[PDB]
Symmetry: C2
Amino acid sequence: HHHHFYTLNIAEIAERIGNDDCAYQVLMAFINENGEAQMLNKTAVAEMIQLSKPTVFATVNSFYCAGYIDETRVGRSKIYTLSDLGVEIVECFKQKAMEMR
Amino acid sequence: DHFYTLNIAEIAERIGNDDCAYQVLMAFINENGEAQMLNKTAVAEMIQLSKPTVFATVNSFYCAGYIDETRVGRSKIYTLSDLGVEIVECFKQ
């Protein structure tokens, strides 16, 4: 293509994500059973979520743009990992009620 | 009280460099430079990408606080948030 600081309320972000089935699952996909932040590609993320690939891929790409996950290029592939911001958003889900994940 | 200090310059660069995110955010700025309200269907018709891609992007932009949502009857109408406005401002100068 040709077209190549703020105080954020992450509690309110957690609330909105909590109410979006795909967003919630994409974010928590990066947390393992031990509760640690793991590295994944989009294919991996999509494999643990029962929604279309285009939907999941776009959500992953959006989360990168938003600064919730960082990107590591390897060959033609991209590996994603939670950022500091992404982890703090995850932490907002501690003792938070969830309705139909 | 949990707030986070966001570097808008970083987000701005990431959004700017991604053809999909840039197009979705900028959809909300009319040809005259004024902010405008749009539903998901209108955003999709403005962009040469699949409907599922565009819809998921709008949804994640809402979650991120880049766009605000108003209910009109049963529909969801979206506008740039104060944060959304600030990101666009990074392109402006």
